[PDB]
PDB file of C-alpha atoms in Angstrom:
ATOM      1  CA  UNK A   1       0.832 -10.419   5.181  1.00  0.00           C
ATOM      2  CA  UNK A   2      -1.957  -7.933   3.774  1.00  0.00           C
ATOM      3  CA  UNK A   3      -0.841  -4.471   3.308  1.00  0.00           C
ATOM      4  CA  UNK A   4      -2.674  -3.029   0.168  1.00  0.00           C
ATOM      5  CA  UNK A   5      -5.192  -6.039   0.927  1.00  0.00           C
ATOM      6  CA  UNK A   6      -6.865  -4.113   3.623  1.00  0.00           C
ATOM      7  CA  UNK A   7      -7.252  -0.753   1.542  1.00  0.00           C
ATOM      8  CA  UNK A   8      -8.665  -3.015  -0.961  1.00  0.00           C
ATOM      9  CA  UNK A   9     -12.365  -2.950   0.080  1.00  0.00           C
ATOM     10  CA  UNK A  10     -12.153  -0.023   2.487  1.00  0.00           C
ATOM     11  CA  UNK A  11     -11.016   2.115  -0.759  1.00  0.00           C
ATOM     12  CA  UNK A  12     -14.633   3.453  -1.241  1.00  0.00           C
ATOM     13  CA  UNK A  13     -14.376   5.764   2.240  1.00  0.00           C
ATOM     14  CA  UNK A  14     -12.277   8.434   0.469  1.00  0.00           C
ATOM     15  CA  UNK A  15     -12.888  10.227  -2.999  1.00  0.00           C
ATOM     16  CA  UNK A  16     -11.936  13.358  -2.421  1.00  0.00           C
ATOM     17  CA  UNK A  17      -8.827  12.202  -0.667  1.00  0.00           C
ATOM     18  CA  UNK A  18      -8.188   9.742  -3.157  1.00  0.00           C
ATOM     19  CA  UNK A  19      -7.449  12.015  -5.761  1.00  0.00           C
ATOM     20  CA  UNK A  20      -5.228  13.982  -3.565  1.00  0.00           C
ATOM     21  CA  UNK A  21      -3.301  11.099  -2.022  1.00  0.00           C
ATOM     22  CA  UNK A  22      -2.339  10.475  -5.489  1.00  0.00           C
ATOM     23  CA  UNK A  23      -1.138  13.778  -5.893  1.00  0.00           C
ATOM     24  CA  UNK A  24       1.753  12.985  -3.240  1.00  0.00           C
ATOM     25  CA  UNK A  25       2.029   9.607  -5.247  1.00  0.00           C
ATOM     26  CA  UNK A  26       3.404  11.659  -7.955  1.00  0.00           C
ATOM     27  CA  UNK A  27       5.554  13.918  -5.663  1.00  0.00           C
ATOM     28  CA  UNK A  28       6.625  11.992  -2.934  1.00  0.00           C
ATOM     29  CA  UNK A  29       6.127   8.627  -3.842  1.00  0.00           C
ATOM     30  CA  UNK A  30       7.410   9.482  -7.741  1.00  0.00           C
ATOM     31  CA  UNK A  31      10.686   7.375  -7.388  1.00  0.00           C
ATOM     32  CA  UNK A  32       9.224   5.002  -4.332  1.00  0.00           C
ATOM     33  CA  UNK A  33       7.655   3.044  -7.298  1.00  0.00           C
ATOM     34  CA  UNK A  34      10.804   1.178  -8.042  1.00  0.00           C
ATOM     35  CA  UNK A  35      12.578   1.477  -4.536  1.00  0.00           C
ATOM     36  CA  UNK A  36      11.215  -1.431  -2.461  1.00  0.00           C
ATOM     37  CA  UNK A  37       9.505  -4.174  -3.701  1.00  0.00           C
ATOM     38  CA  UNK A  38      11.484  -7.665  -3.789  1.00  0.00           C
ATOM     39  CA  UNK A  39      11.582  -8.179   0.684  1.00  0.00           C
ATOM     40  CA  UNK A  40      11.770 -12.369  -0.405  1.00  0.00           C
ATOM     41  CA  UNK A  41      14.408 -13.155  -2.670  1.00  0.00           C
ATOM     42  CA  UNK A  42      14.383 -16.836  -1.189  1.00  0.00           C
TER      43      UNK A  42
END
């Protein structure tokens, strides 16, 4: 559907929070990289 396509252009609301959200991208979502990804292996 459009998941990452809707933070696409609203992705200029939040700096400051960007920085930190990536923060918990390399804490929390360190090993959620690789786990989930293929949902259509037709």
């Amino acid at each position: 559907r459009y998941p990452y396509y809707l933070s696409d252009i609203t992705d200029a609301f939040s700096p400051q929070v960007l920085a930190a959200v990536i923060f918990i991208y390399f804490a929390a979502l360190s090993p959620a990289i690789t786990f989930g990804g293929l949902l259509g292996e037709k």
